Amino acid sequence: AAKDVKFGNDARVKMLRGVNVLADAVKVTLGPKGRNVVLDKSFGAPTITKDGVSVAREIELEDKFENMGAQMVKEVASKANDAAGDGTTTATVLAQAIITEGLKAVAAGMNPMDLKRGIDKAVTAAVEELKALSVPCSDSKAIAQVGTISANSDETVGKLIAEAMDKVGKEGVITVEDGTGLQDELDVVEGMQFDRGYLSPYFINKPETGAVELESPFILLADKKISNIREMLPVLEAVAKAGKPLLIIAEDVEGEALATLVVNTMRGIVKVAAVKAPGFGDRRKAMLQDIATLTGGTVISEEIGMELEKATLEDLGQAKRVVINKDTTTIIDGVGEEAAIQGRVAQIRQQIEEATSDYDREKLQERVAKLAGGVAVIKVGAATEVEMKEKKARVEAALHATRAAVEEGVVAGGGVALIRVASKLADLRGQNEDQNVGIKVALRAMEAPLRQIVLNCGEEPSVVANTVKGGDGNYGYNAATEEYGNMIDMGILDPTKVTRSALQYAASVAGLMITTECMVTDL
Amino acid sequence: AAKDVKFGNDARVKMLRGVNVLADAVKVTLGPKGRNVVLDKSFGAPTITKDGVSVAREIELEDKFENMGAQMVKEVASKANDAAGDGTTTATVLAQAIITEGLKAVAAGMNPMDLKRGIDKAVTAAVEELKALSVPCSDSKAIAQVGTISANSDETVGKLIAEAMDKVGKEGVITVEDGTGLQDELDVVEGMQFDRGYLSPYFINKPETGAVELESPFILLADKKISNIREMLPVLEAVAKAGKPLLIIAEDVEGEALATLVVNTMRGIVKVAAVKAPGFGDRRKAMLQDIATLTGGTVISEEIGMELEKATLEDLGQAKRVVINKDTTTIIDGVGEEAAIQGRVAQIRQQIEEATSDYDREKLQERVAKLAGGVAVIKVGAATEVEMKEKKARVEAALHATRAAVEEGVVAGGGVALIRVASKLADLRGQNEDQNVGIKVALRAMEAPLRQIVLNCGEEPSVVANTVKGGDGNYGYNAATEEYGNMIDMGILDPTKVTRSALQYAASVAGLMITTECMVTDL
Amino acid sequence: AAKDVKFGNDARVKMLRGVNVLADAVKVTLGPKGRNVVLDKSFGAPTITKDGVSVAREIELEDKFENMGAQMVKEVASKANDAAGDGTTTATVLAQAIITEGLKAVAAGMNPMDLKRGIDKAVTAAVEELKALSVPCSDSKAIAQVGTISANSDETVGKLIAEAMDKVGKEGVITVEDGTGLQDELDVVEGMQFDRGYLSPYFINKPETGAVELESPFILLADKKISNIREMLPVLEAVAKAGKPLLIIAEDVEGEALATLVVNTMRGIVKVAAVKAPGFGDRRKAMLQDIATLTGGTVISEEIGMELEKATLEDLGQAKRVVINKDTTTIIDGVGEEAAIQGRVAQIRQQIEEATSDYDREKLQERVAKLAGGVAVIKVGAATEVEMKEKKARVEAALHATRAAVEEGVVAGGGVALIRVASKLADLRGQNEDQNVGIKVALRAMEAPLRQIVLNCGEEPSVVANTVKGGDGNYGYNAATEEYGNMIDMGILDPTKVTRSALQYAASVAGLMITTECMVTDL
């Protein structure tokens, strides 16, 4: 394209404008008194929403430069939600704050690199402080309390989570499914989960949540790199004859002919999803075995002279359901052979006993944990299909909030934790003055979420912030009841992981953007 | 595509303008002295109408923001007509009123969230007041009086309704069909009705009323989720050979291949409609059985290893006629086996006797009520096909009006009930002053319908409103005769359900719109 | 030409906007926190001053409506400014707050008349509270502090004022002159000041103040009025030989005969001034004698039979310089005779004792006092001439404020009095709600200026205001200290009169602005 190139402050004002549109649109929804946002749809009537993630998804600007600013913050802030299951809007609010004051200082002649070092330092210390402020959430009593809090004070949801976690471990794999009636059901089943997402976003299925569900799919295990459809057609035909969907777990699927056809062609004729095999090197092969035995299928390895051209249906494994997302694949009910699965777990258990290094032992037991761990399936029952569907959503939300809570504890919600740790860091300094203003920039930015929340309440944000800061510990402002108090006692908290991810990612883009001297885009 | 984003008062004036165009166009038709509205048609000569619903359907604005305002109010107001069988225009008039004054207050600096709380409170109390003001309509004498009133004082229509309702219960399923001659006919027949509408609006048949009629259709019962046409083609072919239309009652039909072909392809070759099975969980399966026995067909369940690939015509049930709409499916004459149907009803009746909980008993008898209830078919006879067709329409209307009347009674029509309950709530207050103006905003809005009605009469609306308010009970203004009096005695009333739905939905959008800070639309 | 007229809110908005613009600049400047200010001039090099007013003076609004609205505030403010000597800004600040609220109320549609009444009522109450609150001016140390306030942390000015004040006496008038050199000089000047107006503004000299200063004025004293030229003429002839500027003292000059000839006939190229002789009756004569002695000139009376014509220049005394203002005319230094002046004083002094009556004593004592007191002159040095002018202006302002402050007594500054009174005021209720709101508005207005100072501080005025209100007695916030302490103890006090004056004027303006439905402008 002939390009349009901008440098320094020119590129600065451009990015700031794009960020302000994105942040201002999204932040109106912040807090219990958050306002609505109308998103036009050609499909029919507009959508009125308060989900800041939905709003962000719709933000695209006309000016190429401003749009670059917005798309940058959107990409990083989204990583927060992916990591902690929440944090995107807060990440956006913080990012806008750091970027606004950062660029002001830059334009005032301060050194961008120093400013960033200062911002980065304040964030390091602040994360330490949050870690210290964190209230743990380990015992089943705590787990349930967090669960119900997340489920809008639903004692039943908290119970479900706590029960599932107890029956499968706090770091065990738990799924949520539709109930068969009024009563909730919970049953551990043969399954597994690995950190590998879909190869193509175009594999997204009915689940609007950005995931893909496959009922009774055929699992295809091939440690080869499939770039062409030719040597896979026979399998595809057989699968098609079965009418069942397919899950391709290979070393990697290349977008030359395979991923191309699998997506561009299979837009209705079949249901095929593809993901990379877990791990690398030799472990990649071993793990595929675990998955194979688990699903009862066999792996096609060129090493053994296995040919996908001859891969029959009996080679393919199967599971009651499979759910894949951005960065994870969960095999819910492997049709494997109980004894076979137990045999492998034992085989690996033996290998662990005869391990000659910590690294070997560690990875070895991570594998047995997956196989021997199983999947806990929660079946949300209710009186009506509507209630059932609504409760199910609540359970899914509470489950992600609670898991984050068990991992890093919990902290005063309502934007109070950030304003708390910030008030502590008032004496923090750096290698020099620029670095110092960098530190101040971040500390002041940490007050943005609470001030926004109080803004939507029709209250004075600088007065409430001033008050909350003067307090100590988990003392804050409850925007729901609009009264001060102990945030934790008032049941207003966030998993420390989301507040952390939000701050870190926010500081990440803010740092990159503050140290950007040139922007290039098509005319 | 690049978006155009508006915040605060800017988005405010935009929505208000779009709402005023929609409301002003529709409200000219309000009352006995309502004016006409000409709707251009490319198809030929323009249509002159007084049906406010038809007018609304045509309203689309050029400005993307203003159009969003109009489409919002149209979507919610339509829910009133769907719920109570009327109320859309009143809902629009009220909505415009609440929104107009609400936004004024917002722009005056009042808290949007408070204003909405106040509006919401006044509506809660007002609905209580309407409930108190309601004159019941239960005895057959009342039922007939309401019926004839709705049928433009036709004693025969009232009789028909009362007779049908008596022969099948006030909450029983009653249909209206074309007569075979001069005399009206009424006969209860084997049938059923469940709250499940068409999956695709594109299934609408000849009935312009937004419904779909199917003569002697083949009912296909499958508790599976049909997303692909492949495993259903054989059935479709067989059905095609029969020339009879088809009704697909499945767990859900996904728009991947099935709903896609069934709609996009079957635009003339066949007549196929699809709806979701009633209920969820285990009840979904049980109910499908009821429907199966009722229509004489069998359900295809993967659990039993049933394959749609082998679903022959004998598996499909049949009914004399089936009528599906936005949110309901009515099986008018099941070709089921009398004894079989009686057997099931007995079987379930036994289950009720051995029930171990209120929830079980309740749902169990709801099912027997459907099967054992049957459908009352009214056959509108007349001297000429024109008369027959016109009377039939009257019967259908009177039948919505009367059913709504039996459910929640009846109240002074002519916009008098709303202005009545409002005059009572003059001392109502809230948590604060903003909330108070919120309350006033709603109370003043409740006078809009009557004032509009009187406006179309060429009379002074503030004088008539002032007078009606000073009165008491069902005392109001009869815009037909243009004299004051007792609305109920003058036979000018509305089912309490429509006045309620109108107010609630109106306050709903008005509330959302008043608490909207940002609008996003394509450039 | 044609005028554009606006009515209702539209008129109001223009005024409001205009008011805000003017107010905003003023508000920031006001308070020691605010920085001084320099004013640009197209005319020439920029003018350097430290006045809130000046900013207002500079500010003109392009929009006629806005400008006019702005003008209204300024004019009132100036009036307050003159009387108070200070608090120009305060009035402006107060007015703006009041106006905005009042306008909002107008937006409310409450009848503004009540609001104005309420405001007036509130003002009256506040005034009473203030008066009680106010305490007598403290000693010179306080005076210096008072001076410093006018100083805006100009220590020297306060010192100068105090020093000048001490020597002269508070009662004694102090005059400011440009410094001879960088070092300030304070010289007491012998001479008497008597409060006499200048007959015509025409006489009024070049300087903006309009006080007329004559260099080496010649003083002619006549008891008799100067009827006509002819009697004058022989005086004039001597004067022609003269040509040093002439000052004339006469009991009165009948305007037409003298003035008509003088103005029309006489170019008046030589500077001339006329003043009425101080006092009336014998006392007036006595005063004249005192003046005459001080001048060293002689007075001619009909009773003496001395002729003006006969009287030569020698009879006329000379003064080093004379300054005349409308209120008063003073002679900075008559050449006089040292012995003569002293002798006269003694003679008068003897007379004072001699007279039995108080009345006689008072007149005599007053007469002696004037001569004895003399006038005090203050010179302001500066690094540069420009600075000196700026300094001088500040000094002058301080002096007036100080003088006013002392007589009035001092009240806590910082708008502490205003806030304090308001709380009491709040309890008071207006006759009707509309009045009530207005009353509240006035109270709110009072609070605001405290906030503005706080804002300059950058401290959140809310907390400060709240804290200030909470404290009983004199409780306030010292900007400089940024510590809470008694205002009196702090010694930062604003004059009661100034505070009172500003408030009243602001209220008046605000009320007027609110009332004014319509504005008219030229096209």
Ligand SMILES: Nc1ncnc2c1ncn2[C@@H]1O[C@H](COP(=O)(O)OP(=O)(O)OP(=O)(O)O)[C@@H](O)[C@H]1O
């Ligand atoms: N250290 C201080 N703490 C509190 N308030 C102070 C302090 N020093 C002065 N002030 C206040 O600042 C105001 C005086 O400033 P300024 O003279 O600018 O206001 P103004 O008289 O209204 O404006 P102008 O003098 O331009 O008319 C008074 O209310 C005074 O009490």
Ligand SMILES: [Mg+2]
């Ligand atoms: Mg001042």
